[PDB]
Amino acid sequence: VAESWCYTQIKVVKFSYMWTINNFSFCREEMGEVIKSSTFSSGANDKLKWCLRVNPKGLDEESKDYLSLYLLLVSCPKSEVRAKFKFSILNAKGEETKAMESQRAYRFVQGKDWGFKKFIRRDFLLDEANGLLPDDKLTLFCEVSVVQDSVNISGQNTMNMVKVPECRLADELGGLWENSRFTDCCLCVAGQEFQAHKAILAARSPVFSAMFEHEMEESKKNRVEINDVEPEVFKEMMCFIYTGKAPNLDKMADDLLAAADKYALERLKVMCEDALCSNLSVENAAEILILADLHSADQLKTQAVDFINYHASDVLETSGWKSMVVSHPHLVAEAYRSLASAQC
Amino acid sequence: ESWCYTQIKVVKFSYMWTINNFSFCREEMGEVIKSSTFSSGANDKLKWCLRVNPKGLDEESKDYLSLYLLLVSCPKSEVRAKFKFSILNAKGEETKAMESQRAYRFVQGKDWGFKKFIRRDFLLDEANGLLPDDKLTLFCEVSVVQDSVNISGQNTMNMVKVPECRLADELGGLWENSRFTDCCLCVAGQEFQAHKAILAARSPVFSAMFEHEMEESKKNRVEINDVEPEVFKEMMCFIYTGKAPNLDKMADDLLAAADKYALERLKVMCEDALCSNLSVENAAEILILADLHSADQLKTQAVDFINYHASDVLETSGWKSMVVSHPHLVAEAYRSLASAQCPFL
């Protein structure tokens, strides 16, 4: 309807970073002495690289009590990148208070530097009443808004007289479980019967498939001894194997995660990690560390280490952490190495 | 999320210096009191010192006492330093002492400092309380700072990220290894292997006769002749890999196979591929194929194309061939035209 479908959508890659200028009150690398930062990227593939250039005393003498900051593009593929940036003045609580943003999105090319002359006054930063230098530490928050804005669409306005269902590989196999049809062999776990067959299980499971052919199916095809999981978790992985999804996640993520680690099912591991990553807590941190370590969830190890870094004030005395300490010296050694060396 | 950090290392150390009986020292010297060396902070890396001039080295310093600081030893020529000095607050005096405003480069063996301090008699004046037991206490703070930084930081994190979904890898991976050879189907000479449950699920027609309680005999001597082996391989690739890159040039045979196997999905993709294949010279053949295969969507598209391009479609002899061979098609086309064109004589 309406012939054309002009739906021009603007793609804005928004991402922000924060500074840490140690003891700015007496750095005094002024009047042309260049200072750089850590190069940073948006994360969406490696094309864009920025480096800051701060002048405590700005170039030219007109910015005597004023400072000017310039963002420089070190190198990028030639695409005439257009982007927008903003900065702010920060408080002790780490929230932007006096936020100033660039009026327009500035066109960038390789090696070009864009910034505002006399960006901000020196004395207001140095004002004691404003409290912008807690422990003489200066923080500066920047929010980049790189925009591509390169999209052209033509056509088509197909009325779609016939509705085409998508691929039916999952639901057709998903609906066969309750019917329990075409099950050649038996399958019992923890004394409860779950009628399934080894063909599709072998097809959708390399571990069992390797285990299937090697000197069991000749004799013990009908009965296979499974005890690592209770039926409530085995049915969940069964549903995941056939349907391709495990909707009952949050209530039973942990034991599902352990079962996935036993069978080396990476997708189950990461999605259970997603379920449990949001559930990080002071009281539950220790058992999360132990479960991640036993399951070799390195990413969950890192996130839990970060949680301990941010909550060392209270997590350390928790009885779970003490149990981890007495039981798992290696975990606490790793935590000490991370929080000591990387942080300092 | 960067964690810029940007450490700027500074080592603030100090060196108290106290001269016993300062009144008597003014006479038995004219130039310098070379003090002892000192170090602290970073593992005693740097040796520093100082020397006062109770009597001025030069005429300018004859008016004002000079405490002109010196460097003893250092590894690097470039050493930026801020040095502040005062009295050791015996009474209440945290003022009256100056500062070094600008960071100066301290090279090996060189001396640097200030010299305009105080009048000599005023310093010796007891009213100012600068002679505790005839001693001169100093609170000499030195702050060395370094070529900037040690940048980074990074703070690269966005949740945890997940691997690619693994529906197709399991099917494709098993086929490549050629493991679990459940059956050997010999069709057109070439031998093809496959499994039971997946073929039954994807193809209901294959599931039809294998549901009749006979499977072992048929698999050993399966009869497949309506479809060429190449289209069978294309079917295998579409089922397992999930793509049919060369479907465009084999739509007719693949569409016929889908009709035989009652594959609505494959038939739909075949019709869609054939939709963007109509030309001005072979429209009759496409319409005949659509009618034979009961392609309702393709048949309707062909009818619309003919209605639009009848000025040239009827010119070709294919229309006359259809008229002679298929009178019922002409009859129903005329019925549709008359019903659609109610007005006009």
UniProtKB/Swiss-Prot annotation, chain B:
Pathway assigned to this chain's UniProt record: Protein modification; protein ubiquitination
GO CC term, one of those recorded: nucleus
GO molecular function terms noted in the UniProt entry: identical protein binding; molecular function inhibitor activity; ubiquitin protein ligase binding
Tissue/organ expression: Widely expressed.
Source organism, top-level taxon: Eukaryota
UniProt effect for mutating residue 111 to A: Strongly reduced affinity for substrate proteins
UniProt entry keywords in alphabetical sequence: Cytoplasm, Host-virus interaction, Intellectual disability, Nucleus, Ubl conjugation pathway
Result for mutant: residue 102 to Q: In NSDVS1; gain-of-function, reduced BET proteins stability
Additional information: Antigen recognized by serum from scleroderma patient.
Disease: Nabais Sa-de Vries syndrome 1: An autosomal dominant disorder characterized by global developmental delay, impaired intellectual development, speech delay, and variable behavioral abnormalities. Affected individuals show congenital microcephaly and dysmorphic facial features, including round face, small palpebral fissures, highly arched eyebrows, and short nose. Nabais Sa-de Vries syndrome 2: An autosomal dominant disorder characterized by global developmental delay apparent from birth, impaired intellectual development, speech delay, dysmorphic facial features, and additional anomalies including congenital heart defects, sleep disturbances, hypotonia, and variable endocrine abnormalities.
Stated name of the protein: Speckle-type POZ protein
